[PDB]
Amino acid sequence: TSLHMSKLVPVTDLSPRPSFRYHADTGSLDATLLPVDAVPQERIGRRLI
Amino acid sequence: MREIVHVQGGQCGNQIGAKFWEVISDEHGIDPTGTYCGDSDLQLERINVFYNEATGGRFVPRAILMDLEPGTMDSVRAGPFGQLFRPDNFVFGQTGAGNNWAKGHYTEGAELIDSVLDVVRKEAEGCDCLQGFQITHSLGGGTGSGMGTLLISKVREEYPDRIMETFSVFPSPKVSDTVVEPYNATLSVHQLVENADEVQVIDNEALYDICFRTLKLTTPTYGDLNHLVSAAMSGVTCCLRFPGQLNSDLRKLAVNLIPFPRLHFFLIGFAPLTSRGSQQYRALSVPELTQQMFDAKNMMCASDPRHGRYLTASAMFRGRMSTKEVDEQMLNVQNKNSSYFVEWIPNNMKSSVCDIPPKGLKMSVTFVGNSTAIQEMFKRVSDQFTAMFRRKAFLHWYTGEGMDEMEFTEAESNMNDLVSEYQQYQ
Amino acid sequence: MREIVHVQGGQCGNQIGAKFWEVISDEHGIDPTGTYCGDSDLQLERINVFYNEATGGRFVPRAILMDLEPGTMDSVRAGPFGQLFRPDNFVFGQTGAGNNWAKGHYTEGAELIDSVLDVVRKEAEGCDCLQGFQITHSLGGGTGSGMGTLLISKVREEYPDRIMETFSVFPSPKVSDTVVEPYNATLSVHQLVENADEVQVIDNEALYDICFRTLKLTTPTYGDLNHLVSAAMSGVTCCLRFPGQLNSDLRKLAVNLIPFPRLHFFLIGFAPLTSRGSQQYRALSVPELTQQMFDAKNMMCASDPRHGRYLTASAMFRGRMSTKEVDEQMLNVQNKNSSYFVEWIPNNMKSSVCDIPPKGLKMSVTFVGNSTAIQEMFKRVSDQFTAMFRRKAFLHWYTGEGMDEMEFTEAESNMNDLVSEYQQYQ
Amino acid sequence: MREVISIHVGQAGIQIGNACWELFCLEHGIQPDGQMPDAFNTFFSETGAGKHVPRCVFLDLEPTVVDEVRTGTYRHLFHPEQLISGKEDAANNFARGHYTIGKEIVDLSLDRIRKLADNCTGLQGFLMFNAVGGGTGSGLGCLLLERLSVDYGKKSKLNFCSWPSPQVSTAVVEPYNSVLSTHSLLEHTDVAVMLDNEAIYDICRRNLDIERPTYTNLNRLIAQVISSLTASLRFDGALNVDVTEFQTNLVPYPRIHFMLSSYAPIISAEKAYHEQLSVAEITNSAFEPASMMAKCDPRHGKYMACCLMYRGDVVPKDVNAAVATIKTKRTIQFVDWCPTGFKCGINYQPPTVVPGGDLAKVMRAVCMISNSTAIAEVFSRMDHKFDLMYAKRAFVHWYVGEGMEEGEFSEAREDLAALEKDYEEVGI
Amino acid sequence: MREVISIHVGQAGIQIGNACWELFCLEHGIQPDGQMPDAFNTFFSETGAGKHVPRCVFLDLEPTVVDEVRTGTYRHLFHPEQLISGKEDAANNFARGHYTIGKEIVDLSLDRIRKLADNCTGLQGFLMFNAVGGGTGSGLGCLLLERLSVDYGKKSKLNFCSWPSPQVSTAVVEPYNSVLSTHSLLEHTDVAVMLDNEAIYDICRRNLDIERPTYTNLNRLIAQVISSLTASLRFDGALNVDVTEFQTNLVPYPRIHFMLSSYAPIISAEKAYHEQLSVAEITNSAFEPASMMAKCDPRHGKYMACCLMYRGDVVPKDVNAAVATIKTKRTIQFVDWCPTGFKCGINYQPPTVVPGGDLAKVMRAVCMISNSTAIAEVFSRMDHKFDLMYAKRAFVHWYVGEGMEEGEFSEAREDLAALEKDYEEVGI
Ligand SMILES: Nc1nc2c(ncn2[C@@H]2O[C@H](COP(=O)(O)OP(=O)(O)OP(=O)(O)O)[C@@H](O)[C@H]2O)c(=O)[nH]1
Numbered sequence A: 001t002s003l004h005m006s007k008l009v010p011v012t013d014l015s016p017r018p019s020f021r022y023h024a025d026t027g028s029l030d031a032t033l034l035p036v037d038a039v040p041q042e043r044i045g046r047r048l049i
Numbered sequence B, C: 001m002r003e004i005v006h007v008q009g010g011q012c013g014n015q016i017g018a019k020f021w022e023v024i025s026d027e028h029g030i031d032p033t034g035t036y037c038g039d040s041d042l043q044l045e046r047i048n049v050f051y052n053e054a055t056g057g058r059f060v061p062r063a064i065l066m067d068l069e070p071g072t073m074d075s076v077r078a079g080p081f082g083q084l085f086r087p088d089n090f091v092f093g094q095t096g097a098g099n100n101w102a103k104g105h106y107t108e109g110a111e112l113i114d115s116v117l118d119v120v121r122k123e124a125e126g127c128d129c130l131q132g133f134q135i136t137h138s139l140g141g142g143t144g145s146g147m148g149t150l151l152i153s154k155v156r157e158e159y160p161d162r163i164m165e166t167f168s169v170f171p172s173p174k175v176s177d178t179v180v181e182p183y184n185a186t187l188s189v190h191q192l193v194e195n196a197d198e199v200q201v202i203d204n205e206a207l208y209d210i211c212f213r214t215l216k217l218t219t220p221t222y223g224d225l226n227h228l229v230s231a232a233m234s235g236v237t238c239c240l241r242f243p244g245q246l247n248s249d250l251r252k253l254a255v256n257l258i259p260f261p262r263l264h265f266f267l268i269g270f271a272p273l274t275s276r277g278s279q280q281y282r283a284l285s286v287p288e289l290t291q292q293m294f295d296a297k298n299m300m301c302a303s304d305p306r307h308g309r310y311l312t313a314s315a316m317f318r319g320r321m322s323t324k325e326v327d328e329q330m331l332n333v334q335n336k337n338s339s340y341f342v343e344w345i346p347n348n349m350k351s352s353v354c355d356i357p358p359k360g361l362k363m364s365v366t367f368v369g370n371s372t373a374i375q376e377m378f379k380r381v382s383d384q385f386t387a388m389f390r391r392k393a394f395l396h397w398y399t400g401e402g403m404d405e406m407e408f409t410e411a412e413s414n415m416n417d418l419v420s421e422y423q424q425y426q
Numbered sequence D, E: 001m002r003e004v005i006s007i008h009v010g011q012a013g014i015q016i017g018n019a020c021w022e023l024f025c026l027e028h029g030i031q032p033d034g035q036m037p038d039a040f041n042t043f044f045s046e047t048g049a050g051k052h053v054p055r056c057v058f059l060d061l062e063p064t065v066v067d068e069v070r071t072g073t074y075r076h077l078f079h080p081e082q083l084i085s086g087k088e089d090a091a092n093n094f095a096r097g098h099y100t101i102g103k104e105i106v107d108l109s110l111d112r113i114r115k116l117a118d119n120c121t122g123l124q125g126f127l128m129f130n131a132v133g134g135g136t137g138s139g140l141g142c143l144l145l146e147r148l149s150v151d152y153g154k155k156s157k158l159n160f161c162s163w164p165s166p167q168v169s170t171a172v173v174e175p176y177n178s179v180l181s182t183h184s185l186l187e188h189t190d191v192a193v194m195l196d197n198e199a200i201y202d203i204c205r206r207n208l209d210i211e212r213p214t215y216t217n218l219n220r221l222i223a224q225v226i227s228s229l230t231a232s233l234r235f236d237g238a239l240n241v242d243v244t245e246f247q248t249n250l251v252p253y254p255r256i257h258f259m260l261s262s263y264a265p266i267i268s269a270e271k272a273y274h275e276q277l278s279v280a281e282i283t284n285s286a287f288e289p290a291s292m293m294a295k296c297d298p299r300h301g302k303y304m305a306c307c308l309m310y311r312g313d314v315v316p317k318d319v320n321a322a323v324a325t326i327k328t329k330r331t332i333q334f335v336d337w338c339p340t341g342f343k344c345g346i347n348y349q350p351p352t353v354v355p356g357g358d359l360a361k362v363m364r365a366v367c368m369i370s371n372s373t374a375i376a377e378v379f380s381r382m383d384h385k386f387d388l389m390y391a392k393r394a395f396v397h398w399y400v401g402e403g404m405e406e407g408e409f410s411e412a413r414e415d416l417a418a419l420e421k422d423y424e425e426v427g428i
C-alpha cells in the first residue's frame, strides 16, 4: 500500500517531470525598491581625450 | 469490556479485513507476533474488544476468515500481520463457488456454514455480552454475497438482540468484472434488509474517485482502496476501544441513525485526506474537517447526497478537540444547507468526540450518514437486474444449483420496495 | 477582520499576480518557504487579509490561480516564491482558449468555471467577513478575458455586496500583438461595467513609457512591467494591511471616487520613481511626490489626463509624514491646476496615510484617479473594433460556438454610451 | 489441490499439445526429463523424488504421430502408457473413428482417465484439444465426450476445437466430419472454443510479419492462449478467474457456449520495443476485428459476454479504463440484456517466451474468450458446405459402408440448423 | 499532453519529412536509434526503456523513396510499419491516386493514424505534408484530407503544400493536378501554407550563396520553419502561440486561409559574422519581397494578417519596436479592416543548426507567416496553365480512363475561380 499506515498520507510522493524546462524566467532590472540595478555601464560618446 | 466478533467473508472481504487488522494492530501496539511494543496504558486496556488473550501471551485477533477458495487465505497468511491469526479460524472449502449466489447460499457453502458457525460459537459465548458482529464481504461474487448471506441469517436467528454491522461492498456500475453482479446483489439485498442492523454501503468507483481527487494518486491499487475502508471501520468502533469526552459505541450509532428499521443502508466516509503538497498546506481546524465530510468527492458511495435528503447524519469525531466547535459545525452545515436535510427531524445530527486520534494526525472524522440518495444505488442495480432477468440471461445456473424464478421476483420486489419508502421520505 | 481573495486569470494575470505575491511576501517577511523571518508585530498582525494559516506555520496565499493552458502556472510554480500556492489552488485546463472571448465565456470556459468557484468558495467563507476580491486578468486575450469577466459576474451574483476590485491590462492600440484585441476588449468591457466595482486600467504601453522615460531601463522585460503594477497593487490595499494616522480601505476608494453608478475606470501611478543613478539626487518630500504622481509620464494608462479633466482623484500615501504637508500639497494642485479638475464637485481628492512605508523606501505614493480621459481608449479600441466589424472581420471563430451577431453590436453600444457618459462631464 | 486433465485427440490435438507441454514445462521449470532443478500441481504430478509426469492422455488413431513423440526429445517425460496410439487411422471418415476403429481404443484411453483422476484430488475439468476437420478428432472426439459425460458428467469440459476453415481447406470430406460433430459439440461440451486456420495465418501476416510460417508456429500461438486460460489456477493473481468462472459469466443459455479467442499482442522482436504496449493499447488490438482466431468478423455480429485475461504487470485501474474505452466505442456493439459483460482477471505472472520462438519479451498480454452472435455465420458457411455435397449423396458410400445409417446426415443437419436459429433469436 | 501527428505524403512529403525528423531528433536529443543519453511529447512518444519513436505516418505508392528510409540510418528510429508503402505509383495522375489503386493504402494509413492518435492525451493538429502537382501527393492527399475531416471532426489539419513553381514545373500534367487539388486544400484544410520550389531556390542563391542547391538543401530550410512553428509547443516562451491561436489571428474567413512563410536569419556561415542579426535586422529581411517562400510579391497585394514567430534571445521590446518600424513602412499595405495585424510570438530556445548543413548558428530567428491579397496571382497563374491545356482536351483521356468523371475538371476550375473572386473582394 502506497498510503501511510495510520495517517493516510501517501509516502511514495512521486516526482512528475516538468513539461517544459520552465527556465529563463524573470529577475528584473529593478531591485526591491523599484529603482535599477548596478549593471556595467557604457560610454557611447566620443573618444575622451 | 465489550467484544466484537469480526468475520471476513469472500475474497474481497478477506482483503478488506486483513487491512483492518493491521490498522488496528498498529493502533494498539500489536507486533506481527503478538506483543505490545510501547508503554501506554491507553493503547492496551480495551484490547478485549478485537483481541483475545493467549496463555502463550499473544493477542490473537477475534477474526474468522471465510472463503471457499484456498488461495486468498494463503495470501493473507503469508502476508505481513497474517501470523497473528489463529489457524483454526481459517475455514477453507476446496470447490470455489465461482461467482454464483446459488452455490454460495444453497449449494456447496451449505456444508461449510455448519463448520464456520462452530468457530463463531467458540468466539461468541466466551464472554457475558457481545456487542456486534462486524462482517465485511462483497456483494458481487459468489463466496462473498452467497455464504455471507448464510452467515448473516444464522447469526441473527441464534442471536436476536446482538448488533451486526455490514461493511459490504456493492456491485459497481461504470466498470465491473463479474457479469452476474446484478444477480449477485438483488438476491443479497433481500436478506440484508431483514437480517441486519447496519449496512455501510461501499462501492468501487468512488473509492477510486477518492484516490484520484483527494490524494491525486497516479498509482492506486486494491490495497489502498482497502486501507480507506479499514480507516473508516477503525473510526466507527473507536469509542468501544478508546476513552473520550462523549463516548458513542456501535449501538449508539444504530439508534440515532435509523428512523424505521428497513432504512439502514448508510454511507461511510473518512475526512482528513491530503494531497502531496497539500500535507503542509492544509489546516487542521474542525470546520475544515466538517467541510471534507460533506462533499460528494469524499463519499465512499458514488450515490451523490446532493441528489437526495439526509434523513439522519452522524460523525464520529476523534482527537484532541473543542467540544463546542464539534457541534456548531454541525449546526452551521444544517443551516447554511437546510434544503439538504429532512424537515421532520430538527437536529439531524450527532457528534461524538473520542480523545485518541489516529497515529500521526491530530484529529479525524468518520461520517456515517443515512440518506435518501441510496435510492440511486438500488435503482441502477434494479436496472441491471431487470435487463437480464426479462430474457432469463444466466438464469439456469441459479435454477440448476437449485432455486426457482419466484425467488428472483421476490428479490426484486423487496429492492423495488427499497426505493419506494425512501421516496415519500424526501 | 478583513479578507481579500486574489484570483488571477490567464497568462498575464498569473504572471502579474505571481510578482504581487513576491512583493507582499517581502513586505510581510515571508520566505519562498513561508516562514516569518523578522521580529515585528506590525509586519505580521494583519496577515489574514492575504494569507491563511495551516498548522505548523506555512502561510499560504489566498490565491486562486486559474488558466485554460498548462504553460504559465507551472512557470509560476518552478520560479522562486512560487511554491507558496497550494497544488489544489491551481485550476488547470487542457487544450486552450486561443485568443477567443467565446472560448473562455461560452464554451471551454463554462465547464472549468464550476471548479473555479469551488476553490473560490472554500477561500471565501473560510473566515468571518470579506472585504472583496482582487482580480488580475487580461482583456487582450482569450482565456484571460473570457472566463475572467465571466468569473466577475459569477462572484458578483454570489456575493453582491463585496468590493469587486479588478486590475485589467487593456489592449492599447499602438504597439501590441494579437489581432483580435478589439473583439476581446470590447466584449469584455460590456461584462465589466455592471459586475465590477473598481476597474483599474493598466496598459502595457504606458508601463513601457514609465520604463523608458522615468526609470530609463535599457531592456525592460515583462518582469519589469509586472514589478511596477505589483507595487501599485500593494499600495492600494495598504490600510487593510498596516496601521496609519488616516486609514482607507477599498470601500473607502469606491465611495470617494465614484459619483454615478458606472463611472469606475481609474488610472494608477506609483512614485518613489527615479532614474538609474538618481537615487543620490532625488528628494523624498511630499511636494516632489505630488509633482511626480501628477506627471502624465507617471500614468500606467496612456490616456493623457491633460486631454480631459479629473472627475475625482485619490492618493493613498505611505511612510512617515506630516498631515498638513499632505493637505497643502493636495490643495495646491487644485488651486494651481484648475482647468484639469472638474467644477461641479468641490475638493476633488481624498488622501490617506499609511505609517508603514514599503521596504527600503522612506516614503511612497499611489494615485488612483477617476478621470474623464479614459474615454480616449474607449474610443481607440472602439474605432479598432468597428473598422474590423463593418466589413466582417474575424467572426466565424466567434459565431460557430454560440454567440450571435447581436451581442457584438450591443457590446459596442454599451461601449458607445459609456463614452457618451464620460463626455457628459467634460 | 488444483488440477485439470488435458485430452489431446487427433493429429491437431497431439501437435497443439506438443507446443502446450513445451510451454508448460518451461513456465514451471520442469526439464524434458521431468526433474526440475505448488504451481506445478495443475499440469504435473509428483512421481518419484522429482519426476513431474505431465497430466495428459495423448490419443490418436495412427501410429505415426504418437510413436514419433515416443522417439522424440520428450520420450522419458510423459508416462509412456499415457501415449495411447491407435493402429490404423479413421481415414477422414467420421464412421471409422466413431464406430469401428474407435470402439477399441477408447477403452484403453478411458482407463488412463481413471488413473489420472484417482491420482488427483479436486479435479476441475477436461481441456480436450481436437480437430474437427476429418476423422479421429471428430470420431473419437464424439465418443470420448459421450462416455465422459456419463461417468464424469458433473465437471467442466473445455474443448478447444479446430473448426474447418472458410476458404482454404486440406480435405474435401471435411464438411461432412464437422456437420457430424455438432451432435456431440452441442450438448456433450461445456465450452467449445472455435479456432480456425487463416485466422492464425493472418495474425502471422499483419503482426508477426512472418511470410512463410508452419503449423508449429500456429500451435505456439494456441499454447500461449491456453496458458492464459488456466493462468489463475497455477499462479496467483489480483482477480482470479478459475475454470468455473470462465463459464458462469460467459455462457448465458445452455446451448450458447461457442466462444472465440483473441490474444494480444502477438508481436515480434522488431515492434516490441517500438511500441509502449500497455493495458489500454493491448485490449484495443484485442478487439480489432481481424484479431479473432476464428475468421469471424465481430462487426456483422454483436457481443453478449466478453471475458478478459490480463496477464503480467497489469494494475486493476487500467483494466477499468480500458474496458470503459472499449464500451464507449461505437463499432463494438454489445447486447441489451447485459449492461455488464467484461469478466476481467489479472495474473501477476508475465507471459513466458519459448527460446528461439516467434514472440518477444512482453510484460503484458490479454487473452479474450468472447461470446457473440457472430459465431452463427461460422456454422452457416459449413451448412452451405454440407448441402452441395449431400445434394446427390457424395462420399456417402464410406460413411454408410462403415456402420452409420444414412439418416444421421439429415439429423445432424437439422440439429445444426436449429443452432443458427437459436443464435438468431438470442439477439432480437 | 500537447501533441501533433505529422503525415508526410508523396515523394516530396517523405523527403521533406526526412529533413524534419532529422532536425527534430538533433534538437531534442534523440539519437537515430531512439534513445537519448518531458519537452518531447509533441513529436515523440516513449516506449518505456528510454526509447522514443517519431510521431509520423509516411505515405507513398512507390516503394522506392520509402524503402530508402527503412534501409538508411533512420530505420530503427521509426516504428517499422509507420513507413507505409504500396506497389506501383499513380504516375503523376490525380485520378490514379484517388479513384483507383490508392484506395487500398488508405485503410492501412488511417489504421495507424488512429493508433497514433489514441495513445496521445490531447491532439492539437494533424500536420500534413504534400506535393500538390503530382499523383500521390495530390490524389492520395485529397482523399486523405477528406477522410480525416469526416473521422476527426474539428481537429485543425495543418498543411505545407509544395505547390508548383509559376514558371518552371518539371511536368506538363502539373497544371491539372494542382487545379484538381483545390477541391481538397480549400474546404478540408485550415492551414494551407503555400511553398513554391523556385522561391526557396532563389533564397538559397541570394542568401546562402549556393548556386546549385539540391532538394535536400531545399528541405533543410523548410524544416527550420516548421520547428520554429512548433517552438512554443515544445519549449517555453514569453508569448506562446499554439495551433489554436493560429486559426484565430491569421484567418479572417473560412475560405481565405492561404499563407506564405518567410524565415529570415537565413545566413551563410561566412556572412553570419559580418552583421549583427538583431531583432530589427532579421524582421526587415523577413518582409523583403524576395525571401518569401512562394513566388508572390506582397507589394502588389494587401496584407490582412501576419503571425511572426521571433525565436531566441529576443526581448519583447525589440519585437514591439520592430513591428512599429514595419508599420511605418509604406512599401507594405495593410487592409483597412485591420488596425492591428501583427500577432507575435516569442520562444526562448534558439534555433539549432545541423552539423554539416547549409545554415549557421544564429542567436535569433523570425518565422513570418502571413495572409494577403497577393496569393491570388499564384492561383490565377495556373489558371492560365489549365485553360491552355484543357482548351482541346489534353491528357484527359488518361484521367477518365481509370474512372474520373468527364467534367470534374470543370468544377475544379470554378472552384479556383471562386477563390479568385474572393481574394479581390477582401481587398476593396
Ligand atoms: N491448428 C492446427 N490445425 C491442424 C494441424 N494439423 C492439422 N490440422 C487440421 O486438422 C484437420 C485434419 O485433421 P487432423 O487433425 O490433421 O487429423 P485427424 O484429426 O487425426 O484425422 P485423421 O487424419 O483421419 O487421423 C485439417 O483440416 C487441419 O486444418 C496443426 O498442426 N495445427
Ligand SMILES: Nc1nc2c(ncn2[C@@H]2O[C@H](COP(=O)(O)OP(=O)(O)OP(=O)(O)O)[C@@H](O)[C@H]2O)c(=O)[nH]1
Binding pocket: E009, E010, E011, E012, E013, E015, E016, E060, E089, E090, E091, E092, E131, E132, E133, E134, E135, E136, E137, E138, E162, E164, E169, E170, E171, E197, E215, E216, E218, E219
Ligand atoms: N520541397 C520539395 N519538393 C520536391 C522534392 N522532390 C520533388 N519535389 C517537387 O515535387 C513535384 C512533383 O511531385 P513528386 O516529387 O513527383 O511527388 P508527388 O507529387 O507525390 O508525385 P509522385 O511521384 O506520385 O510521388 C515537383 O514539381 C518537384 O518540384 C523535394 O525533395 N522537396
Ligand SMILES: Nc1nc2c(ncn2[C@@H]2O[C@H](COP(=O)(O)OP(=O)(O)O)[C@@H](O)[C@H]2O)c(=O)[nH]1
Binding pocket: B009, B010, B011, B012, B013, B015, B016, B099, B138, B140, B141, B142, B143, B144, B145, B176, B177, B178, B204, B222, B223, B225, B226, D238
Ligand atoms: N476493494 C477491493 N475490492 C476487491 C478486492 N478483490 C476483489 N474486489 C472486488 O470484488 C469483485 C470480484 O468479486 P469477488 O469479491 O472476488 O467475489 P468473491 O470471490 O465471491 O468474494 C471485483 O469487482 C472487485 O471490485 C480487493 O482486494 N479490494
Ligand SMILES: Nc1nc2c(ncn2[C@@H]2O[C@H](COP(=O)(O)OP(=O)(O)O)[C@@H](O)[C@H]2O)c(=O)[nH]1
Binding pocket: C009, C010, C011, C012, C013, C015, C016, C099, C138, C140, C141, C142, C143, C144, C145, C169, C176, C177, C178, C204, C222, C225, C226
Ligand atoms: N503585464 C503583463 N502583460 C502581459 C504578460 N504577458 C502578456 N501580456 C500582454 O497581454 C497580451 C497577450 O495576452 P495573452 O497572454 O494572450 O492573454 P491570455 O492568453 O488570454 O491569458 C500581449 O499584448 C501582452 O502585451 C505579462 O506577463 N504581464
Ligand SMILES: [Mg+2]
Binding pocket: D010, D011, D062, D089, D136
Ligand atoms: Mg490423421
Ligand SMILES: [Mg+2]
Binding pocket: E011, E062, E089, E136
Ligand atoms: Mg512518385
